[PDB]
Amino acid sequence: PQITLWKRPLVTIKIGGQLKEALLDTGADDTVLEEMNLPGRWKPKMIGGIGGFIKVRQYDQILIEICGHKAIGTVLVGPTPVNIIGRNLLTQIGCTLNF
Amino acid sequence: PQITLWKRPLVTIKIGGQLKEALLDTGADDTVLEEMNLPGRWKPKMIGGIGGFIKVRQYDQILIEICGHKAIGTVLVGPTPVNIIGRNLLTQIGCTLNF
Ligand SMILES: CCOP(=O)(COc1ccc(C[C@H](NC(=O)O[C@H]2CO[C@H]3OCC[C@H]32)[C@H](O)CN(C[C@@H](C)CC)S(=O)(=O)c2ccc3ncsc3c2)cc1)OCC
């Protein structure tokens, strides 16, 4: 679909079999979700944002459905203010910016 | 144009008579620019992201040109690591997300 930007580009995602809301974020290299339980092995990682760095759990090759489009990739879990879908998964669902 | 997301969506902007590179960021409500001494009145503000908050100066009715398309609105100036074009200006150039 075509998504305009008058409101936050919030969409419903499915991950670990649960539904959640997340922001499509072209300024984010990586996908970061609020704390949640996810199956699988993970490793500690650090990521930086506008205000400094946070510690996250890095889960590799996770299935996530974004408005019904499937992606399989890296998902970071940690104390983000909002669930964000970054470019690593936006590229998999075929997202572009147009103006 | 159409901008794919394999790489960071960096574009040239013109603001206060100067050229800069800036990230087109659908996850950013507002526009945040690197330290720059703009003329006119401003108001202090705090904006938050991953890692916490930063102190910025809020300027109103600032003209920015983004790949030849003009936009006018609020611009926040402070110690951001990157120039960020947010939805307040992206809407004005008709920018949409398409997958
Ligand atoms: C030189 C580089 O230094 P650096 O690496 C960080 O650089 C950076 C690169 C890009 C961005 C843009 C930010 N992306 C992000 O956090 O992405 C992370 C996840 O993926 C990784 O890739 C990029 C970073 C990692 C989002 O797109 C927009 N954000 C809001 C978002 C959290 C929704 C609430 S916002 O900027 O917080 C913001 C902007 C305007 C605004 N108006 C009112 S609120 C408000 C808040 C910030 C910093 O670390 C040094 C400590």
Automatic annotation (TrEMBL), chains A, B:
GO terms for molecular function: aspartic-type endopeptidase activity. InterPro entries: Aspartic_peptidase_AS, Peptidase_A2_cat, Peptidase_aspartic_dom_sf, Retropepsin-like_cat_dom, Retropepsins. Pfam families: RVP. Residues 20-89 form the Peptidase A2 domain. GO terms for biological process: proteolysis. It is found in: Host endosome, Host multivesicular body; Virion membrane. PROSITE patterns: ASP_PROT_RETROV (PS50175), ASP_PROTEASE (PS00141). It comes from the Viruses. GO terms for cellular component: host multivesicular body; virion membrane. CDD domains: HIV_retropepsin_like. This is Protease. It comes from Human immunodeficiency virus type 1.
